[PDB]
């Protein structure tokens, strides 16, 4: 079928390649501007295909669908919408254009974590499986109904980028693949999300990643891994910003360890530098070890050689 890919990032790319690979004609591609010396994976691919791209700043001003960028998109006649990892706002005009509408990826269980941090979220929380949805775009935020959805556990040190590159990316690609090949038969379903379970939560940036020390050890190594690598959690040390890489919870057994105190303002107690990493204490008086730092602009540098 006819497919316009609107999104954007290697994902975007990935499932362009399969989905053109499994003779499908992408009409063409709709991605964010250069970033700039940054041309984004998805429009370097379409372009090196022949394949049209578009890199439209908006398609909406003063909330009204800009008329330019909806002619242009309406141009390629799309039969169905393939929307990787959008960040751009696109007008129902258009999800709603193609014949089959529009299909967007999610990585989360749907109704569980709506929002554009869900990956982070499921980190956050501590939640025990995780996994992503396909679901038909409607007007509302990750409310649309479902077409498919896979699981997978969460393995108790995952971070972001475990599990993203475990799971969520390559079998992503392949339920994105899965979910076309269904459309294309007339199978796919249309599965009303339930009402229970449903939440949101906010978009992480740097700036609400900071680290909440009143918690116990085991909410403080989820929030770490959960931010971890972006946009990474992060505490003011000595004066300055320090993000938090690579957490594990730890346990007890003496003698072996030496650390070099450190005080971290807020902290239950002081933290401890020690051979292998930065030991962080929670409210409970638990611990968790973290085995990377980074400073503003940060080079990474091991936990261990804070003083050094």
Same mark, same amino acid.
């Given at each position: 079928?006819?497919?316009?890919?609107?999104?954007?990032?290697?994902?975007?790319?990935?499932?362009?390649? &399969?989905?053109?690979?499994?003779?499908?004609?992408?009409?063409?591609?709709?991605?964010?501007?250069?970033?700039?010396?940054?041309?984004?994976?998805?429009?370097? &691919?379409?372009?090196?295909?022949?394949?049209?791209?578009?890199?439209?700043?908006?398609?909406?001003?003063?909330?009204?669908?800009?008329?330019?960028?909806?002619?242009?998109?309406?141009?390629?006649?799309?039969?169905?919408?393939?929307?990787?990892?959008?960040?751009?706002?696109?007008?129902? &005009?258009?999800?709603?254009?193609?014949?089959?509408?529009?299909?967007?990826?999610?990585?989360?269980?749907?109704?569980?974590?709506?929002?554009?941090?869900?990956?982070? +979220?499921?980190?956050?929380?501590?939640?025990?499986?995780?996994?992503?949805?396909?679901? +038909?775009?409607?007007?509302?935020?990750?409310?649309?109904?479902?077409?498919?959805?896979?699981?997978?556990?969460?393995?108790?040190?995952?971070?972001?980028?475990?599990?993203?590159?475990?799971?969520?990316?390559?079998?992503?690609?392949? =339920?994105?693949?899965?979910?076309?090949?269904?459309?294309?038969?007339?199978?796919?379903?249309?599965?009303?999300?339930?009402? &229970?379970?449903?939440?949101?939560?906010?978009?992480?940036?740097?700036?609400?990643?900071?680290?909440?020390?009143?918690?116990?050890?085991?909410?403080?190594?989820? +929030?770490?891994?959960?931010?971890?690598?972006?946009?990474?959690? +992060?505490?003011?040390?000595? =004066?300055?910003?320090?993000?938090?890489?690579?957490?594990?919870?730890?346990?007890?057994?003496?003698?072996?360890?030496?650390?070099?105190?450190?005080?971290?303002?807020?902290?239950?107690?002081?933290?401890?530098?020690?051979?292998? =990493?930065?030991?962080?204490?929670?409210?409970?008086?638990?611990?968790?070890?973290?085995?990377?730092?980074?400073?503003?602009?940060?080079?990474?540098?091991? =936990?261990?050689?804070?003083?050094?």
């Amino acid at each position: 079928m006819k497919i316009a890919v609107i999104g954007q990032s290697l994902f975007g790319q990935e499932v362009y390649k &399969e989905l053109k690979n499994e003779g499908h004609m992408i009409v063409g591609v709709f991605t964010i501007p250069d970033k700039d010396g940054k041309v984004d994976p998805l429009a370097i &691919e379409a372009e090196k295909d022949g394949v049209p791209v578009f890199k439209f700043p908006r398609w909406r001003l003063k909330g009204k669908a800009i008329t330019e960028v909806v002619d242009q998109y309406k141009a390629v006649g799309a039969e169905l919408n393939v929307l990787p990892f959008c960040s751009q706002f696109i007008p129902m &005009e258009v999800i709603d254009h193609p014949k089959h509408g529009s299909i967007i990826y999610h990585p989360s269980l749907l109704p569980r974590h709506r929002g554009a941090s869900a990956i982070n +979220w499921t980190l956050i929380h501590g939640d025990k499986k995780g996994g992503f949805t396909v679901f +038909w775009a409607d007007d509302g935020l990750d409310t649309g109904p479902i077409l498919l959805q896979r699981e997978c556990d969460v393995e108790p040190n995952d971070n972001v980028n475990s599990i993203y590159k475990r799971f969520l990316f390559p079998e992503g690609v392949k =339920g994105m693949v899965e979910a076309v090949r269904l459309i294309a038969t007339g199978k796919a379903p249309r599965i009303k999300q339930p009402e &229970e379970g449903a939440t949101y939560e906010c978009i992480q940036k740097k700036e609400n990643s900071k680290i909440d020390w009143n918690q116990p050890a085991e909410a403080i190594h989820n +929030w770490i891994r959960g931010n971890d690598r972006v946009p990474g959690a +992060w505490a003011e040390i000595d =004066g300055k910003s320090v993000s938090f890489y690579g957490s594990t919870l730890l346990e007890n057994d003496h003698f072996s360890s030496n650390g070099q105190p450190l005080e971290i303002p807020g902290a239950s107690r002081a933290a401890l530098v020690t051979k292998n =990493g930065l030991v962080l204490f929670g409210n409970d008086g638990k611990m968790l070890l973290v085995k990377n730092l980074q400073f503003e602009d940060g080079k990474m540098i091991p =936990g261990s050689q804070y003083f050094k």
